[PDB]
Amino acid sequence: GYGKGYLAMFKNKKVRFKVVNSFPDLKVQFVTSFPDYKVKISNSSSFCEETIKIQVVTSFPDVKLQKVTSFGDFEAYID
């Protein structure tokens, strides 16, 4: 699927993360330290640039995300 750098295209934008179990666009591991990107999670589904299918994993992810409340690389609404 997508590579590590894909999310770099959404600097200061909002995307939609759709949780899947099979065939994701990105395998995502959520971490509290040393992420590839900082993501702010939103409570609103509006103004999402694009839908990215993510599968949450605990080992060997395509990308590591750290949830933050302020100063994120991008925003994501999860469903």
Query: What is the Cα–Cα distance from 2 to 26, expressed in whole angstroms?
Result: 6
d(CA 79, CA 8): 21
Burial of 41 (0-12, 13-18, 19+ CB in 10 A): middle
Tell me, in Å, the resolution of the deposited structure.
2.5
How far apart CA 79 and CA 72 sit, in angstroms, is 19
Q: What gap in Å lies between CA 25 and CA 33, rounded to an integer?
A: 23
Tell me the backbone φ, ψ of residue 8, rounded to 5 degrees. Answer: -60, -25
Measured between alpha carbons, how far is 11 from 27 in angstroms, rounded to an integer?
19
Question: How many Cβ atoms sit within 10 Å of the Cβ of residue 6?
Answer: 14
Residue count of the chain: 79
Task: Say how many C-beta atoms besides its own lie within 10 A of residue 61's C-beta.
Answer: 19
> Which residue, 13, 22, 14, 10, is CA-closest to 53?
22
